[PDB]
Design a protein around this motif. Structure first.
Motif, PDB file in Angstrom:
ATOM      1  N   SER A 124       0.448  -0.991   0.207  1.00 18.17           N
ATOM      2  CA  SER A 124       0.328   0.297  -0.072  1.00 18.17           C
ATOM      3  C   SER A 124       1.151   1.235  -0.413  1.00 18.17           C
ATOM      4  CB  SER A 124      -0.911   0.033   0.945  1.00 18.17           C
ATOM      5  OG  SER A 124      -0.012  -0.414   2.196  1.00 18.17           O
ATOM      6  N   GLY A 125       0.766   1.558   1.224  1.00 18.16           N
ATOM      7  CA  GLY A 125       1.254   3.449   0.954  1.00 18.16           C
ATOM      8  C   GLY A 125       3.108   3.660   1.047  1.00 18.16           C
ATOM      9  N   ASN A 126       3.221   3.375   2.718  1.00 16.49           N
ATOM     10  CA  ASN A 126       4.529   3.623   3.014  1.00 16.49           C
ATOM     11  C   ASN A 126       4.966   2.130   3.508  1.00 16.49           C
ATOM     12  OD1 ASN A 126       6.027   6.249   4.058  1.00 16.49           O
ATOM     13  ND2 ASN A 126       6.455   4.100   5.466  1.00 16.49           N
TER      14      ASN A 126
ATOM     15  N   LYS B 221      12.361   5.636  -0.577  1.00 18.33           N
ATOM     16  CA  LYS B 221      11.318   6.573  -0.670  1.00 18.33           C
ATOM     17  C   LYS B 221      11.088   6.945  -2.109  1.00 18.33           C
ATOM     18  CE  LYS B 221      11.868  10.311   2.923  1.00 18.33           C
ATOM     19  NZ  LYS B 221      11.954  11.663   3.727  1.00 18.33           N
ATOM     20  N   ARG B 222      10.070   7.989  -1.714  1.00 16.41           N
ATOM     21  CA  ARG B 222       9.896   8.315  -3.202  1.00 16.41           C
ATOM     22  C   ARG B 222       9.077   9.152  -3.381  1.00 16.41           C
ATOM     23  NH1 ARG B 222      14.165   6.414  -4.729  1.00 16.41           N
ATOM     24  NH2 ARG B 222      14.312   4.393  -5.467  1.00 16.41           N
ATOM     25  N   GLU B 223       9.322  10.519  -3.168  1.00 12.22           N
ATOM     26  CA  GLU B 223       8.171  11.908  -3.261  1.00 12.22           C
ATOM     27  C   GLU B 223       7.747  11.768  -1.574  1.00 12.22           C
ATOM     28  OE1 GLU B 223       6.982   9.879  -6.361  1.00 12.22           O
ATOM     29  OE2 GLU B 223       9.151  10.535  -5.955  1.00 12.22           O
ATOM     30  N   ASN B 224       8.502  11.639  -0.702  1.00 13.95           N
ATOM     31  CA  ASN B 224       8.231  11.352   1.738  1.00 13.95           C
ATOM     32  C   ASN B 224       7.006  10.114   0.986  1.00 13.95           C
ATOM     33  OD1 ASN B 224       9.212  12.359   3.449  1.00 13.95           O
ATOM     34  ND2 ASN B 224       7.438  13.116   3.327  1.00 13.95           N
ATOM     35  N   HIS B 225       7.458   9.106   0.314  1.00 12.79           N
ATOM     36  CA  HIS B 225       6.548   7.538   0.883  1.00 12.79           C
ATOM     37  C   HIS B 225       7.381   6.711   0.113  1.00 12.79           C
ATOM     38  CE1 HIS B 225       3.421   9.938   0.927  1.00 12.79           C
ATOM     39  NE2 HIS B 225       3.231  10.997  -0.212  1.00 12.79           N
ATOM     40  N   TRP B 226       7.593   6.117   1.569  1.00 11.94           N
ATOM     41  CA  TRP B 226       8.893   4.689   1.497  1.00 11.94           C
ATOM     42  C   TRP B 226       7.447   3.650   0.647  1.00 11.94           C
ATOM     43  CZ3 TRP B 226      13.504   3.815   2.369  1.00 11.94           C
ATOM     44  CH2 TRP B 226      14.466   4.956   2.907  1.00 11.94           C
TER      45      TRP B 226
END
Length: 50
Positions: free
Chosen positions: A11-13, A37-42
């Motif tokens: 999912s998200g992080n 991390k990409r665009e502050n989302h792991w």
């Protein structure tokens, strides 16, 4: 060629990269996975056909 494909299953992080690495191999059908991390989302990225 280890194609670093984004989180399909995951999912998200991401944090449990050990899980990520399985949650790509087992669930999907990648060689493995790893958190990044990409665009502050792991994201758990999967790595196919490596």
């Amino acid at each position: 060629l280890c194609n670093e494909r984004p989180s399909q299953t995951w999912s998200g992080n991401c944090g449990n990269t050990a899980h990520c690495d399985k949650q790509c191999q087992d669930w999907e059908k990648a060689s493995h996975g790893a958190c990044h991390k990409r665009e502050n989302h792991w994201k758990c990225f999967c790595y196919f056909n490596c």
